[PDB]
Design a protein around this ligand. Structure first.
Ligand SMILES: Nc1nc2c(ncn2[C@@H]2O[C@@H]3COP(=O)(O)O[C@@H]4[C@H](O)[C@@H](COP(=O)(O)O[C@H]3[C@H]2O)O[C@H]4n2cnc3c(N)ncnc32)c(=O)[nH]1
Length: 255
């Protein structure tokens, strides 16, 4: 009832600290730790990295769904490229008995929350005036850990092809944009209600959201859990990579 298992994913070892974090959050470790292996470490370089990592993660999560779903609570400590954190949340896709933790740069317990209340506000800028019935794609910039300047987003030169764009920002940007679970809960509410659902209201024939993110670890995992399989449109996530800009990584997609 207070019992929690641990799920650990590190592809970028603080595992000995995780039971202590549970105790600070009304839990205690139940003895079940599920380690998601970094299967294709060494091939982080070539353009098949995300395809191959997703296949490994999917197989690893399927083999433990029976023990996983038997957990009273699952406490998740995941740090990886944002697309794989999104995919992890998609594989877990269960907002109810799952607690997603955030890693901080300083502190006695790097993975314990720095606050128990809302510390930030999240808000939307839209770079278009009106929706329409023609556009099928939207660009979504997530500027939490840093402000992604618009010159970094692939943008079509001709006006008839320019993709409508929205930005989701926080009042406080930086590595501590998320300090509490309350912060993430509020982010996810804004993301779902004022971004994802708003975009589909504005563009009723939407097929795809292109995501360009600078966010801390808890945010992509919680967005992946928030994905509504076969209901949401395709979410294509791009990744900032050295000397190349934002490159397409992977999609969350219906079947
Ligand atoms: N500063 C900055 N970052 C940008 C910009 N455009 C894209 N980014 C990407 O966003 C991520 C922000 O870094 P973060 O530390 O707040 O969160 C990362 C991220 O959730 C996950 C994977 O890291 P990475 O692929 O490098 O993505 C980084 C950036 O490239 O892990 C988090 N992370 C990485 N290192 C740590 C750490 N020591 N402690 C806690 N979390 C970490 C841009 O313009 N500016």
């Amino acid at each position: 009832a207070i019992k929690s298992s641990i799920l650990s994913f590190n592809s970028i070892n603080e595992e000995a600290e995780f039971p202590k974090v549970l105790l600070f959050n009304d839990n205690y470790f139940d003895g079940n730790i599920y380690r998601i292996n970094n299967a294709l470490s060494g091939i982080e370089h070539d353009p098949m990295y995300y395809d191959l990592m997703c296949q490994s993660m999917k197989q690893q999560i399927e083999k433990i769904k029976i023990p996983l779903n038997s957990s009273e609570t699952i406490s998740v400590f995941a740090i990886a490229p944002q697309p794989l954190l999104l995919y992890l949340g998609y594989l877990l896709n269960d907002e109810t008995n799952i607690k997603i933790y955030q890693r901080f740069r300083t502190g006695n317990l790097k993975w314990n929350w720095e606050s128990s209340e809302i510390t930030n506000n999240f808000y939307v800028e839209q770079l278009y005036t009106d929706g329409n019935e023609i556009d099928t794609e939207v660009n979504l910039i997530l500027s939490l850990s840093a402000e992604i300047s618009l010159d970094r987003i692939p943008t079509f030169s001709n006006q008839e092809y320019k993709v409508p764009t929205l930005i989701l920002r926080s009042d406080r940007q930086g590595f501590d944009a998320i300090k509490s679970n309350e912060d993430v809960n509020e982010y996810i509410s804004v993301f779902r209600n004022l971004v994802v659902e708003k975009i589909r209201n504005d563009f009723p024939n939407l097929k795809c959201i292109n995501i360009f993110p600078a966010t801390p670890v808890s945010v992509p995992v919680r967005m992946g859990m928030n994905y509504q399989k076969n209901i949401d449109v395709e979410w294509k996530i791009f990744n900032q990579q050295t000397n190349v800009g934002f490159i397409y990584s992977l999609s969350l997609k219906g079947e």
